[model samples]
Structures are given as structure tokens and as C-alpha cells.
Target chain A: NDHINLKVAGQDGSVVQFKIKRHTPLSKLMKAYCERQGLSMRQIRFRFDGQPINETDTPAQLEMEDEDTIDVFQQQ
Target chain B: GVSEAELLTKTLPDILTFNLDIVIIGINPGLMAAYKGHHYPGPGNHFWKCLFMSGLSEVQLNHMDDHTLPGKYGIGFTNMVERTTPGLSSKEFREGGRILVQKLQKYQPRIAVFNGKCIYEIFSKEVFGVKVKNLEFGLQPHKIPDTETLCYVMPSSSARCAQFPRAQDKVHYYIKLKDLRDQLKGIERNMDVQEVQYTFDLQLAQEDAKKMAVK
Candidate 1:
């Protein structure tokens, strides 16, 4: 099973690192995450292994590694 | 009080790349801003509230701490005129263009968004050197090289200038807000950021709603 691990950081320095298994699209993960935060898809950006990701591509297109880091942030 | 030369000569804030997703430029500060040490401090001014509701901030953000706005929602705040004046006369805002140009040259934001016909007109004269007459919201994409800043404009937040109560004003602003988001989507395409598709439940929800509506 493929997995995406992300270390979430809050504006005030709180961090929650989680790892989810399965080759789900990054967009899907982001959508669920934003919904939790009461945000829209456009309101957030995700980074894979410390690089920003902005285009609309499927999860299968994103090859997940064992310890890949994904960052989700809202840029105002 | 500092003379105009000194104020102009002073080193402006260095533009932090991607520090803010969008910068809001109003024509000039009002009496309240001058007195309170904050932009759009007057109760009548809708700047902070509008941005918050537009999903630009976690809440109605303050203009004083503009530097932190980008990570919150990639938004920023500025003014066409750094100085405060009583009214919106073109002459009062003429210097706005020069100051704005200086900031743009430095910060190079993804979106160079402005407020009101007055400010945009000043921009037209100062930056583009065009004597534009009619001004409105939305924009024609113009490239500011190296920075990739595209100029955009929005309607004024002054109740007197805008003339619609909060609700009506929201509709107008929401349209612009949507436009800015859409435009950024285009900008992100050219940057080095990776892309991902997380559209699952939302699509299904939309489809279900569509079918229910049809029935």
C-alpha cells in the first residue's frame, strides 16, 4: 500500500505529523483537509517533500515515497 | 512631520517574495487611519472585513501587521497613497503612483490588486502613463517582468464611493475575490510548485446535488 506522510504546522508553531496509506490523489487529501478547516480547494496549497505543488494532477501522477513530506498551507 | 522628499527618499519596506498572495491598494489613508495608526481604521471602511469574508484571512485581519498575511492566506495590504488626505481628488493621489511603482519594483507580488477608480487611474498615469477615464473592477493581464506581477483593480471600500450597504458590496467584492483566486491558479501553473488532484468526495457531492436538482 502506498502512503503519503505530511507534517502539519500551525501558524503559532503547533505541529501534527500524520501518515496515511493508499495511493489516493493529493487533491483528494487536500480537499478532505480543507473541509476540516472550513476552507475551499483554492484556499490551500500542498507541498511534496518540501516542494510546493499547485497544478491539478491526479494522485496516481504523484509517486509517493516511504518518508515523503507533504505540506498543506493557506497563503493569504 | 517629515517632508515629502524625506518620506519618498526613505527606504520602503522590502517586498518579500510570496510574502503575500495579493496586496490591497486603497487610494489614500483617511483621518481615522492617521489617528489610529492603521489602514482603513474608520468604522465605515470595509477593507478588513471584506477581505476576511472573502476568505483572504482567518479573520478580519489588521493592516498594521501586513507582513504575516501571506501564509495566512497569501493576501497583502497596501495603499496607492501612503499619505493621508481628506478626499479622493486626483491631485491628492498623484504621488500614489510614484510610491506604488517603487513598491511594485521591489515586492513583485503575484497579483498587483488595487482599489477604486481613483487609484487605478493614478496607476494608469504614473505607471503606464495613460490618462485613463473610465475605471472598474477586474483586469486585463499585464506582465511585470521578472516579478510576474499582474495588475488588477477592485472597487472602492468607501461607503460614499461605493454607495451599497454591506450586503450589496459583498456581492461586488466576492466577484473580484473569485477572479483573483482564478488568476492565481493560472500563475501557479508556471511556477515550480508540484500539482495534485484531491477531488473526490466534493465531485460526488456535486453530482449528487445535480441529479437531485434535476429530479
Candidate 2:
């Protein structure tokens, strides 16, 4: 079937992308990216548009489109 | 309908006018917010930051921009009553509840988000005449009678609220409110649309160093 293409980007342009099933919890993708960056979940927050996406939410739940870019920002 | 005097007493004016997406209610104004003539003034207040980070407010707005909320973000601001007196008043609380309900009915905001438990507590006890047991944050099990307006509770944006010490934690509750807002509007918001940029806090770097030292 079809998979969602998501790119996780940081302010300084630390851009990375991953493809995953539509139902997969976005946390799964986020964790791997954080691991690659050697960071923790608390260190960064994720959002699409201005909405914060939870670790528990899925692509379909957010109605996110394929190749949508989820920006990663530090949690203040 | 409230007395005309109700309009004059409030040092910091409410930002409400027409129907809006959400109306943020604080218990009342403090000396600083009142003096500055803004909803949540002073650097110690985290309301503005949480508002932006929650995505409810797309741009970083200062307290000075409180009046601009209704026009720009479909958000409104208000308080329980006008005074900064320390202790809670039974009479004032009851009267405040009555006036607030009137406004809710009149303005017809979709959601009335109370900034702290205390404000909601006073409203509930005075209006409903029963104390809420085990009241949790997020959507309260209450609604203004005979209208679609809903009641929501979130951590106080005040720096004094140690229960939700982290600014990020307060923003989390606000984001939950945004989630509710999107649902109520029945609009599928484009998830990847960008109008925000976030920067790291000094504490984060300090925490990173602490973590490294622990390892």
C-alpha cells in the first residue's frame, strides 16, 4: 500500500526525511531522527503548520499529506 | 446584560467583541497587567509564549498586542473580576460567574478556556453550587447551559504555578486546547503549513551538559 513521506526539519536547516505507513505513530519516526541527532524527545518539539503533533498521533489522524514537512523546534 | 459600571471597574479591558474561536479567561488582572493595560503583561507571565507555542497564536504577540488577538487569531481575553485582592470572595466570585455567563451567551465564543483551576473552581462552585471533585486539566465536563459554548481548564500561565513549572508544560495544555479548537471548527488544518520558528532555551543546553556529565 501507500506510505507517507515526512521530512523533519530544524531551524538551522537540519532536514531529514522518512517514509512510513499511514497508521504508524509519528513518534516512531521522531525517535529515530532524534537518535541520529543524538538528542532527546524533551530537547525538541514537532509541529505541522502551527499545530503541535503528539507522539501518540498518526499521520492519518492529523490528516497530514504525503511529503509534508514537520518542523522540529526546541522545547522552551 | 451587565451593569454599565461593570465596564468601568475592570482595569484591564477584555479583548472580546464578536464571536471568536476561543476566549482565554484568567482569574483576574494583576497589578502589572492592569497598569500596563494589557491582558497578560510582565515578563514573568508565560501566557503569550504558551499562546504562540500552542499554535493557537501563529505569531509571537506581546501583552501590548492583547487587543489584536480577536482580529488576528480569533482569540479573546478576559478575567474573572477586576481587583487584585489576595483572598477569594464568595460574593465577587458568584457575581463574576453571572457576568461571565452573560458574556458567553452574548459573544458566543465556541470555547471558554479558563487559564487556571481557581478561576474555573470559583465559577463552578458559585454558579453550579457544587465543588468539583477530581477536576483534571483539559476539557471539563461542563458547558454553559442552553448554548454550544464549552468549558476548558488549563494550567495557569502565571510563573507562580509551580505545578506546571516548565514553560513548555504549560504550552502543552494550550496545544491541547488548540486541538479542541480545530475539532470544534471541523476544519482539517494543513499540518505542514509553516508560520513559526522555535529556538532552544538556555536550560536545554544546560540540561544537555548535565546529561553528558551523568554519562
Candidate 3:
């Protein structure tokens, strides 16, 4: 029962930080962000630790720690 | 009847530019869509509803709102045939298909979306010299010749398209296309991080047209 804190920066310059399960795919975090922005999941991409994060990668898989920042970019 | 024909003669202008991410092409301007000077103006049509429901647009855009799409969403509108007629014959489609290819080559948008299967079927056969016997919807298997631009054929948003009789039914198709569009855009963005692109550029083009109108 482990969770981690992650901060997401949207393309619109809004920052959202929240907690989620360690095993949750990065896509789940993206879905939440997209819902907040009223955007589709495919409309955005995520960058974590200077590399593009695959949707299949989980926080644990990426070895992301508390307060790790994820930047969102418009898909096109 | 005379006035109706005269009104039908009024054609809608193409909302196009090099920066557009996608251009939605219709078979030809229906009388109602043309009369309103927009792509889909008929109350029974589902074009606007699908756009909003599919997440392509934040709000439902009306006929007059067509011009805003290029600037606000990087989307554009055009017709296979520039004529104001509701339907097209084989000969007419062949001629229109040629003009459409020229436009596609000139502007070279990332994707050209056909509103219905008919236009795609005809364009593929007439222009590309490919005979597609069993046509389907969604992205075509073949790309336009000598061009990297992609094509997508969607269900008709017209009220007359009996196959997709309800707006809600057609909404899913639009959503599918939007999903695919995002994927393509993402790939393009990764390929060229420094490339500057916009969704649409209708405002500057409109301004230029106005200046020329007075000249």
C-alpha cells in the first residue's frame, strides 16, 4: 500500500500535484490531467526526468520520487 | 424554383492554409450549408455536434463560426466540387477530384478528412487510379500519391446519410478520428521539436482577402 506524490505541469501553464498508487501507469495520471483541462487523453504528451514517459510506465517503473515534475506538451 | 437554383449557385469558399493540421472535405456544398455560407448549416446535420462530442472543439460551432476553426483549432473546410449543387455525377466528381488534389498538394495539410466514404472512394479511384471495391471508414490504407499527407474517411454528417441516422451514432466516429489525429500530431511534434505550427490561420487570410476585395 504505497503511494507517491507527482506534480504535473500542463501545456496551459497550470501545475497540479497529487498522490497516486506506485503501480499506476503514467497514463492514469495523464487521464486525470486531461479531464481537468477538458482535453482528450491523446491530445497531450508527458515528459519525465528529461525523457518522454511512455504511457505504460508506472511511477515505480520510472523510479520517480516524491515531487517529481512531469511536463505536458500538446501532441502536435 | 428559380430562386432556389440561384441560391444554390452561391458556393462556399474554402477555409484553407498551409498551417492547418486537418481539413474536412465535403462532397459538395448542400443548399442549406451553402446558403448559410458554412460547411454544415442544416439543423438535421451532425457536423457541429460530433466536433464538440469528439473533443475536437470545446464548443459547438455554427455555420458562421466556420471561419473561427482555422484560427482557433487548426482545422479547415473545403468541398470536392466547388459547385453549390447538393450531389455530384461521376464526370463532375472526376473534375472536382483533380482540383482537390491540386489544393491538397499546394496546402499539404497533415491530414485530409473526407466527410463521407463516397468522396474518398471517388477520389481514390479517379485521382490515384486505385479501384477500391470494398470501401470502409476511418483512415484509408493508402496514402495520397507522392505525398506524405494522410486521408481519413468518416461517416457523413449530413441528415441524408441513412447509415448513420443519428448524431449520437456518428459522434463516436468523430472521436476516433480525433484520437488518431492526436497520435499523428504527437509523432510529428517529436520529429521536429523546433518546427513552429498552428492549428489554423483564417484571420490573416481573411484580412488579405478583404484588402483585395476593395482593390
Candidate 4:
């Protein structure tokens, strides 16, 4: 019942959604996303609402809403 | 090629604001950064990338975005020394140390973030008047009494800092600093909200007492 939904858009234009515990850090989602894309953890960066989201930030702390989208990009 | 004379004449004035959350200080401007009127213009510099990756900034900022940062993100930038050169000597830091102290006192930002460990090493000895033999990355265990500003040291974003090869490694310290900033800011916000709520509750109790007297 404490699950929250989050959407992440990859650099390739593919979008993935996840349902996870609100207390969990966004790093978990980022790690899974990186694995699927065969990308290294350090190669990826994520932003929510145009602001860089810290890997340690939780959905509860960020006050993320349902269907809130996060953008993913490669570190350049 | 830009003449050394021209580069010497060009200076990027400190991008500062009073009471900013954080102010980053570089050892001095690089020749290119000074000529371009920006901070950290070197192609090998990872300053912008590290800032964004650390979540300190919303976006990866280019040199052109330097002017907009203080107003937008409550961040500021300054150089320990005003002059531009390829390499800095300890003597230069000794002389520039006084000015650095003055700027820290004048602006009084909550945290003064130094871009290079070496800069902090010298700053401590020269400005704080303490001998610092070894240095580490992240927050330092010292404060500027003139301003009560906290200090932080990060691995240099310059190409020369080969100790930390990858931008990823450098970003780790930046992330730690950002986390601390967020924690402090959160506490401040909570206190402000609590004060407002307390005042409202007091006013409500006073009104209730006045109504009871009428009854």
C-alpha cells in the first residue's frame, strides 16, 4: 500500500515506469534502468521537473506525484 | 593566440550575492576562462558536469550560464586570486589570501566551496592562520570567523588533477556537499514553518479567551 509510481524516460526515447516503496532512493530505479540499457551507473544522469535528482532522494522526500516523469541522459 | 597582456587585463568579476547558500571559489582564473569572461572554460574541466551530476544544479551549465547561476540557484562564484595564469605559485596564494578573506566576509554565504584541495590547504595556512599538512575532500573542519561561513574542499575539476581521473569520482564529493546543504536548508524551513504555526495557535487561543469572557 506504500508503493508509489514513477516514470523515467531514457536517452533513446524509451519510457519505463516503476512501482516502488516511497522510502526507497531513486538510485535503485536508476540502477535497474542502467542495467537494462547496458549502461554503467556512472554514465547515467536523471532529472525531475528540470532539476537534477540526487540518487539518495526518496519519493516521499521529493513529494513525487503519480505519473511524475524523470528524464534520463548520459553524462557528458 | 591571445596575448598574455590582454589576458592579464581581462578578469571575471566575482559572481556573488549576499547570504547565498553556497559560493564556489577557484584558485584563480585560467587563461581561457579569463579571455572568455567565464569560469572554467577549459575543455577538460568537469566543473559544470560535476555540479549537475551531484544534483547541486538543475541543469549542466556552460560558461555562458555562469552569470545566471547566483540569481537562479542561490550559488555564487569567485576566484581566490584575481589574476589569470597557467599555474599558480604558493606565493601568489599567500598574497591573494587576504583578498579571499575579505570577499568571504563581505558576501557571507552559508558555505564556501573550494574547487581544489590544494586551494583549501593553502587557504587554511594563509587565511585561517592554521597549518594544514594533509587535506581531504568534502566538508572541512573549520570555519571563517570573519563571516562564520563553513568551508568545503572538492577535488579539482581541472585536467591537471589526475588523482581523480573520472568525473564520476569527482561528483561523489559534490553529492555529499549537496546532501548537507539540503539537510541544513530543510531544517531551516521546518523551523520557519513551526514558528508561523506557533504564532497562529497563540492568536487563536487569545481570541478564544476573549469570546469566553463575553459569554
Q: What is the DockQ of each candidate?
A: 0.04, 0.07, 0.05, 0.03
Task: Report the Cα lDDT for residue B31, model 4.
Answer: 74
Off by over 4 Å in 4: A1-28, A31-76, B1-9, B86-91, B187-215
Superposed model 2: Cα runs more than 4 Å off: A1-76, B1-10, B84-87, B190-215
State which docking tier applies to candidate 3. Answer: incorrect
RMSD of each: 13.9, 10.4, 14.1, 18.0
Off by over 4 Å in 1: A1-76, B1-19, B60-67, B85-95, B144-147, B182-215
Candidate 3 TM-score, true structure as reference: 0.62
Taking the tens digit of each residue's C-alpha lDDT, what string does model 2 give over A11-75? Answer: 54345566777777888777755544445688788889899888898888888898799888877
Ranking by lDDT: 2, 3, 4, 1
TM-scores of the candidates are 0.51, 0.65, 0.62, 0.65
Q: What is candidate 2's TM-score for chain A?
A: 0.90
> Which 10-residue window in model 4 chain B sums to the lowest lDDT?
B191-200
Model 1, range B154-196, lDDT digits (tens) per residue?
A: 6677655533333223333543564467566663322111122
Separate clash counts for every candidate: 12, 1, 3, 0
Write the residue-wise lDDT of candidate 2 on B1-215 in tens digits: 77655333337778898779899988778877776788788666778877776567666678888778888788998778856642266788778888888888888889989888988888888767779998898887778766788899987888777565445546657756777788888977644322222233445534543454466
Each candidate's interface RMSD? 13.2, 11.7, 14.7, 22.0
Best by TM-score: 2
